[PDB]
Amino acid sequence: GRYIGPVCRLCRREGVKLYLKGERCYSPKCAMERRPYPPGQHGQKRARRPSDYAVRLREKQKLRRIYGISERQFRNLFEEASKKKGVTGSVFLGLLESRLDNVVYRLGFAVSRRQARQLVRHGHITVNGRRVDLPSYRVRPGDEIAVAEKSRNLELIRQNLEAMKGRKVGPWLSLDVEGMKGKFLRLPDREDLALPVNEQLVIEFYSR
Amino acid sequence: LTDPIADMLTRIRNATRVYKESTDVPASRFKEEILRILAREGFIKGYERVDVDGKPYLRVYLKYGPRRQGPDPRPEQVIHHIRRISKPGRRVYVGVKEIPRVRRGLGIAILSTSKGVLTDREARKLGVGGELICEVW
Amino acid sequence: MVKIRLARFGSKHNPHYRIVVTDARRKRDGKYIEKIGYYDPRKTTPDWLKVDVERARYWLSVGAQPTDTARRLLRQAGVFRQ
Amino acid sequence: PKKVLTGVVVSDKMQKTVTVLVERQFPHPLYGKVIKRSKKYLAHDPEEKYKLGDVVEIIESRPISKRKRFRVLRLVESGRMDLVEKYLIRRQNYESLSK
Amino acid sequence: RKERVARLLRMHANHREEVEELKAGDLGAVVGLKETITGDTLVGEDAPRVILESIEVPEPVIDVAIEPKTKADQEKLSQALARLAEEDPTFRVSTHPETGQTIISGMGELHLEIIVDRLKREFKVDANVGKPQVAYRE
Amino acid sequence: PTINQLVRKGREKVRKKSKVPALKGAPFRRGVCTVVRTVTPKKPNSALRKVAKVRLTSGYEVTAYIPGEGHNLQEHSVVLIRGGRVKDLPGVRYHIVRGVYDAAGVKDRKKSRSKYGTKKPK
Amino acid sequence: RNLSALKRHRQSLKRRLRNKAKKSAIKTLSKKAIQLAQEGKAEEALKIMRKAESLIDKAAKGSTLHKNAAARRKSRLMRKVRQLLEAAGAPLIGGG
RNA sequence: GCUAAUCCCCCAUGUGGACCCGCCCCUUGGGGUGUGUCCAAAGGGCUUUGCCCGCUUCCGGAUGGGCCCGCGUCCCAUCAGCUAGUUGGUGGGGUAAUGGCCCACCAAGGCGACGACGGGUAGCCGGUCUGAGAGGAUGGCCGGCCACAGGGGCACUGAGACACGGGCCCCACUCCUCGGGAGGCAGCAGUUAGGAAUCUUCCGCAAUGGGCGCAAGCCUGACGGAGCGACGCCGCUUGGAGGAAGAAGCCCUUCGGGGUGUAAACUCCUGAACCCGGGACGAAACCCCCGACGAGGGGACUGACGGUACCGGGGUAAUAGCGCCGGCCAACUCCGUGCCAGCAGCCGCGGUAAUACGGAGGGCGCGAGCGUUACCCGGAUUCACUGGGCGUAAAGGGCGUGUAGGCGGCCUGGGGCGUCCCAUGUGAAAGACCACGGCUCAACCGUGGGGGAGCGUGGGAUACGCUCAGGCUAGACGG
RNA sequence: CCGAGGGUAGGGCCCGUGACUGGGGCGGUCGUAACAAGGUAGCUGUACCGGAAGGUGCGGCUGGA
């Protein structure tokens, strides 16, 4: 299945804070805030100038690990974006963003994709009325992604919806808080999202 | 002599790298038509029908860029490159759809066709094809 | 003799017939002569049936023979209405 | 259509039959240049009115014998023995190429 | 490995009866098994993967040397004394540490001299027999 | 070469030569051990490499390397082999596959146990 | 270990008899007429070749002969008889 | 020895057809015309002065074939000559039909360096895999064509076969009980053998399709489904949030410390599995009445998968492994060993302090998989058309002469073969591509769209190549 | 008449194998031919000779002076 392991060690190796926990990521108990160096016996040792391959690898695992997705599913997607028309980098990022378990997370139904995933899987998510429990559904523009009207009586969803009141969401999004509905308006433009990934380098990685 | 056309392109090629003012190639109406294009696209200043010991030739007045500053002042070339495609040993015959795009348009391709001796930009608009004579840029 | 027949396509538990004209002794899913319509028995799309009325008329006239359940689809699309 | 070919009689040494040598040209599938391939057809001459050197035309026809499937359509040019020479010399050149 | 039991058989005096089941504490034969050799354990395809006590106690108490003479049917000897070491588990095919010639270890003289002809009349092996050579010293 | 030359003669296609003929193009082949012993490798190495002589079902009789630390292969041992030569032993062009037939896996191997046929311990 | 193909077989043999016998008659009568046509016997030839022609066609009614074979069978017959009769005329009565 | 018919034959009728000969159109044996001759046929069913189902001859249709022709189709030239039914002719046999298919005779030809003959290997294509493309490789599954039905020969019946589950004969093998008989799983399952390796002696004719039948219906291992196998692709799970400047253990340590590590514990939340309930789409035709057995309208029967999917209620935190960590190449330290044991794809590593062996800790990579072996394409621009070379790196023939061949100066004209242009026919379906849509997604699957290269046909253009014609003197030859 | 094939006889091609044998590739004995004018410039086609590399004749090459 998913990576399903110790998630702080990931950030530490990447040297960038990947937001994989929600609440704790903002705490000063965040591993990154206390120990911004790679996991393992050799964390505090002077770095060796990473090779060109070394760069593209790590720049890819970043983007990969963020969305919490298998190298397989990730690769098909990338490859899908290459067959696709126009800009490979953006379209890849777009299709990545278009994943159900991600959209759910973008609308604050959950604090982590990990959590969001479980929400989709365990059923508590719907799409245009009817339930959808597959954490991979390419959400297309125009979709109403609410909470299960049969599962709205759950604190975890409530509290996470309780907080999502005023937050300015994706331009590609709209959020009916309280009523627990959500809409998917558009697919992202390049600028619309800022994440610590030089998308061009991932392309260069598979271009090997 | 076997290929006059190549020779012509070559008399030109040799002439430019030594920066000759002019250069003569023996005359043929087909060589004319190609030289016609060379001037009209600004690869040369033009040509003129001459005579050496009663033999019809064609003086080609070469064209170059400005003098240059630095350790080597030899001007940039106008005809950077010129080579035969179609040859007596192996003829090249593109149709319209397959006429190449020489150097992203920065250069030209010459082709002899049923409507005359045209360029790639030229034969395309007229929607034809023929013998891919040579390529220049 | 030349027939009007359903040639199964689709997949396992996803039937999707092509109403078709072919020789009787031909394999059910083999090379047919012409396609004159399709048929989705599950009815999972709005138009789960479409018959080229004009062409079915041509073949029907020359000796083409519909199957029992072939003409039902054909009758339903009114190839026999006066 | 009934295929029609143009070739030369290189043998009239049969009864009511002549051998028509037909040349064809085409670009090489990978190296482009035009190359000459040829072939010999046995043509039906029911009158024996065609002789060596006759540049003639032969038309696709119903079988006359084994490998006779062409009748002579018409004459185009007579006495082209020079072509006979070319075909004939090479055939004689083969005598050296033995072991 | 997983094995398909197909039919079930009972051997009588003058006929074999096909049966549907063999309850515990009962015996019979089974068709469809291919990898199962004697001394193995079969469990239901979702059953506790246990293994019965094998067997294992008697030790071969006669040993005789066999040499493939002249010479190259020692490889034709090997795949055919393999068809038998798993089916008649009694006899051993041992090669001596020092001066190692093959020592077909039998449970008896007759258990070897009826295995003697299996190799000679059924596996043919151009060989002649005798005794094992000694691991001497100086 | 001139283009006309190319039309006449053309380019010779390159044919590959199987580095493992005895397999009969199979992924693996079974065989019996006629001889099991040690052979010393060539310069600049020095050792006593464990190897086995094997008569394959393919008719061939080859010599095959035995990987890992320690083994149990003797004469008449039925053994499975795979491709891959040992650089230091000329004539050896195949490896015995550990943990198949009368070949045991390496006792007490913890790392990389699949290439040596050892089962995962508790 | 059984079928109705043997039935098909039993039938095949029975048909073979009818077919053979018919074809026999045809060959016998044909050559016979042709022979008379060569000696001519102009009358008796044509007199015979008619019962030949008939039996040729009568067989073609069934599976014995194909139409376009009997057509051939009849063609060659008459051409043979007539060409023969050309040596020593007097072709009477009627047939062709 | 008896006997019926839709079994066989004879006579009649002759729209018509078939054959010979003559004429007419046409042009290979196409279509008329007349004289002569030859040829048809079957009955059964009911509601019964009439329809149904069959029969016969002819013509046209439609679909399915036969045969023929152009071009395309692997390796070896250390295979260079091959051929007497051989090549053509005339006559005849034969066939649905051409043909040396076969036969008699006559002629002496036919093929081959543009590779005959011989040897090796191979079912061919749609496509598939790879590749920037050109190319290379490949034809499993599905679709089209071919070939075969233990090894061979033969013909019979038939619209169709020289017939897998039809017949005859020879062979080999097996098998039943002294004359003879039997068998043909390259059908569906299954056994056995071989092998590194490949499945259930399943369910159902409910669907679609096939043969027969007026119909009811019967048959159908086609087929629709089920089983086994990570073999492949796709989807999903083994949890989610919180949780110490951070327990125990283990590893490292300069003995200060560092690492595993928010990882675990523990807190709360969710709820794969399982439990109960409901429960399919695929199935409306054939059939019945009305109408007329038509058109049209109504009505009834039918589910192998399967009480399966799916929907609802309840509901337990609930599998992780494999490779690698000298360089290529991402991931480093301790101990053990000491050219031993061992690693290895290449360079190479191991000889006492090894990031290269073996364990450990840690780490990197993928994740119900990870690795390995074999093979194919790639990188190999390392057979170089795209797109390489040959003074010294491998490579100019020892030198001439010349055959075939490839190639060829200037001007004008004819033809239009290449070449180019447009139109049109073909380029099946599946696949590929783009678009939407159906299974909750995806794989899978459906519906539309785009069609190209190639060849057929029609028209068009004439610069270059071709060819034909006429002139020139700069090449070349001569005085 | 032809005809599966059976038989007789004589050829051709390819595969496997064979006492013995030729050199080849890979892992101590004798000399020192080549690389420095390698201590006789070297290489060379050929010829004869010698345990062995080699020597020498005739001509050739410079990749020697």
Ligand code: SF4
């Ligand atoms: S807490 Fe800080 S370190 Fe741990 S995962 Fe969230 S962000 Fe990365």
Ligand SMILES: [Mg+2]
């Ligand atoms: Mg793209």
Ligand SMILES: [Mg+2]
């Ligand atoms: Mg790539």
Ligand SMILES: [Mg+2]
């Ligand atoms: Mg199912």
Ligand SMILES: [Mg+2]
């Ligand atoms: Mg003839």
Ligand SMILES: [Mg+2]
């Ligand atoms: Mg064994």
Ligand SMILES: [Mg+2]
């Ligand atoms: Mg070493």
Ligand SMILES: [Mg+2]
């Ligand atoms: Mg053993």
Ligand SMILES: [Mg+2]
């Ligand atoms: Mg008779």
Ligand SMILES: [Mg+2]
């Ligand atoms: Mg018949």
Ligand SMILES: [Mg+2]
């Ligand atoms: Mg008939």
Ligand SMILES: [Mg+2]
């Ligand atoms: Mg009666």
Ligand SMILES: [Mg+2]
């Ligand atoms: Mg009667």
Ligand SMILES: [Mg+2]
């Ligand atoms: Mg009559």
Ligand SMILES: [Mg+2]
């Ligand atoms: Mg003859």
Ligand SMILES: [Mg+2]
């Ligand atoms: Mg004839």
